[PDB]
Amino acid sequence: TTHLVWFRQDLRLHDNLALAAACRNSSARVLALYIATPRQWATHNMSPRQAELINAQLNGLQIALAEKGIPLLFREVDDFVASVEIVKQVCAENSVTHLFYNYQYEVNERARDVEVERALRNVVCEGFDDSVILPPGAVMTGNHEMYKVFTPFKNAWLKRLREGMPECVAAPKVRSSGSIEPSPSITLNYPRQSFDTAHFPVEEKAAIAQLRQFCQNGAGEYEQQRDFPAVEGTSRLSASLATGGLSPRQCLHRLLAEQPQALDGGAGSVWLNELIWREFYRHLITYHPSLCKHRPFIAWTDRVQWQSNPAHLQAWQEGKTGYPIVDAAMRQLNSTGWMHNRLRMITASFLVKDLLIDWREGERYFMSQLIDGDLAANNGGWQWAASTGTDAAPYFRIFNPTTQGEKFDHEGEFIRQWLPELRDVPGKVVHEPWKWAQKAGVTLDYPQPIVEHKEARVQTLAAYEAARK
Ligand SMILES: Cc1cc2nc3c(=O)[nH]c(=O)nc-3n(C[C@@H](O)[C@H](O)[C@@H](O)COP(=O)(O)OP(=O)(O)OC[C@H]3O[C@@H](n4cnc5c(N)ncnc54)[C@H](O)[C@@H]3O)c2cc1C
Numbered sequence: 296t297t298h299l300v301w302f303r304q305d306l307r308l309h310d311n312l313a314l315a316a317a318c319r320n321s322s323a324r325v326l327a328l329y330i331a332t333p334r335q336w337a338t339h340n341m342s343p344r345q346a347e348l349i350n351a352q353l354n355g356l357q358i359a360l361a362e363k364g365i366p367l368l369f370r371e372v373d374d375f376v377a378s379v380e381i382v383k384q385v386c387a388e389n390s391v392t393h394l395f396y397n398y399q400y401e402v403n404e405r406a407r408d409v410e411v412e413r414a415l416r417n418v419v420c421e422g423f424d425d426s427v428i429l430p431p432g433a434v435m436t437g438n439h440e441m442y443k444v445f446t447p448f449k450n451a452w453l454k455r456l457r458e459g460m461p462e463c464v465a466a467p468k469v470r471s472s473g474s475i476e477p478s479p480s481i482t483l484n485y486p487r488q489s490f491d492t493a494h495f496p497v498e499e500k501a502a503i504a505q506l507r508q509f510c511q512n513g514a515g516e517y518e519q520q521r522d523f524p525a526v527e528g529t530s531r532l533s534a535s536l537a538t539g540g541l542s543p544r545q546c547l548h549r550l551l552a553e554q555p556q557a558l559d560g561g562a563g564s565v566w567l568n569e570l571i572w573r574e575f576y577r578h579l580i581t582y583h584p585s586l587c588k589h590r591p592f593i594a595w596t597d598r599v600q601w602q603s604n605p606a607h608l609q610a611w612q613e614g615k616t617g618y619p620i621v622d623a624a625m626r627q628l629n630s631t632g633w634m635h636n637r638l639r640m641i642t643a644s645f646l647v648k649d650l651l652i653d654w655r656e657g658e659r660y661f662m663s664q665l666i667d668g669d670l671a672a673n674n675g676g677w678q679w680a681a682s683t684g685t686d687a688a689p690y691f692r693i694f695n696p697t698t699q700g701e702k703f704d705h706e707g708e709f710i711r712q713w714l715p716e717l718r719d720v721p722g723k724v725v726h727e728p729w730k731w732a733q734k735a736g737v738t739l740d741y742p743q744p745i746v747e748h749k750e751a752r753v754q755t756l757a758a759y760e761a762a763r764k
């Protein structure tokens with residue numbers, strides 16, 4: 296009996312469904328496989344910082360698997376089509392009787408998995424819904440359709456959660472054969488860049504410690520602090536969650552352990568709501584695959600006449616729009632691979648609704664930079680800002696970057712952190728530095744608004760209006 300565990304976006308020993316399931320049979324030979332697909336990653340616009348996070352978790356996992364007496368067979372092919380052949384070869388070469396793997400919901404990943412299952416004729420394959428707390432299809436509407444509005448989805452989700460809460464499975468124990476010697480460190484052949492390991496922990500114990508600490512302190516204050524970018528009021532666990540360094544059940548159980556009432560509206564319930572948004576978006580692409588194929592959820596939005604303007608898109612990408620809160624947000628992204636949620640909303644809105652540039656442009660750019668890049672969450676957030684998605688912002692909802700900035704970064708603390716050239720404009724005017732610049736006969740080394748919000752807004756409303764006709 297030989298059990299093969301095919302890792303992907305789940306590089307952890309703890310609470311890993313396919314892994315725990317392969318090791319139940321203590322008399323079975325257990326092998327782990329990991330296939331690097333540098334070319335499919337490039338196509339999917341994988342961020343260099345995330346590629347680096349994965350590489351780091353991959354070496355740390357190899358080391359942890361060795362102590363459990365489980366060996367990792369590393370392979371590097373080009374794409375998902377090639378991987379099918381590699382899984383076939385590894386099964387054949389090692390006489391694998393059973394394959395255990397955790398499901399991936401994106402169109403390309405699913406197609407690969409379906410091919411692997413068809414190809415493995417004499418093998419028993421068991422996939423697991425490890426990336427979600429509740430599996431797609433667990434929370435369905437009365438006519439067995441997926442929910443289209445979050446509010447009722449959430450209600451039904453909490454209901455089913457209560458009828459049987461999934462539990463955290465433990466890290467497997469050492470194999471009968473004993474510990475083994477780790478193979479030499481792997482190096483992913485994909486452009487990679489560094490990141491703050493303090494904010495985004497690469498080690499499993501560090502990820503867990505960060506979840507612990509947040510749930511103890513942060514989850515209670517969350518509702519009151521989550522809106523301020525200048526404040527560290529969010530978990531910064533999105534990178535671990537996106538790559539599989541942590542599972543959503545670890546977050547759930549650790550949350551309820553510190554905030555008991557989180558399930559019933561008490562403290563910690565607002566943070567839980569966000570984990571339910573994550574759930575929503577993952578089930579949604581599972582039932583609506585076209586969301587993985589650049590299609591909007593609201594068909595008529597495809598009729599909006601987006602602006603083809605290279606100068607405007609470039610200014611947004613480089614953070615030279617002339618709107619401090621938008622610019623500071625882009626420098627944050629470009630330099631750390633992460634952006635505060637409030638700012639992901641503001642910058643995405645600025646691109647689609649002030650510049651009227653196709654949301655797919657902003658999405659791709661975000662993916663290319665985001666250490667937490669994830670199709671369901673990114674596509675979902677972009678379709679929300681653009682009013683093209685499921686339960687998205689209403690088309691007439693056009694965030695005003697100055698108002699947004701005055702609210703959430705009233706003092707310009709965050710702003711002055713990322714825009715050193717504005718570290719002399721006094722407090723309030725910092726949100727509209729050029730208006731003050733003239734009235735002081737001063738030259739700022741900062742751009743001027745590339746668009747006037749009032750007129751931009753009018754033009755956009757007209758465009759949507761015309762498409763919605
Ligand atoms: C245009 C846009 C693009 C986005 N791109 C991504 C992306 O690629 N990857 C990603 O993980 N999130 C994305 N989101 C949500 C995003 O803001 C992040 O979740 C991030 O801010 C989390 O930082 P945190 O870990 O400190 O979050 P916390 O606030 O501490 O939230 C905890 C966990 O819940 C999940 N979460 C939080 N907000 C959302 C959400 N609205 N939808 C789904 N899950 C959520 C994340 O897995 C997160 O780690 C996007 C939002 C917008 C508006």
Ligand SMILES: Nc1nc(=O)c2c([nH]1)NC[C@@H]1CN(c3ccc(C(=O)N[C@@H](CCC(=O)O)C(=O)O)cc3)CN21
Nearest residue numbers: 338339340400401402403404405586587588589669670
């Ligand atoms: N991580 C990840 N996984 C993905 O699967 C995925 C991404 N990211 N990023 C975007 C790409 C592109 N995706 C796509 C885009 C188009 C088709 C597509 O046009 N396929 C049609 C073709 C039919 C025809 O040839 O007429 C289909 O119906 O299968 C499929 C997947 C999904 N993709």
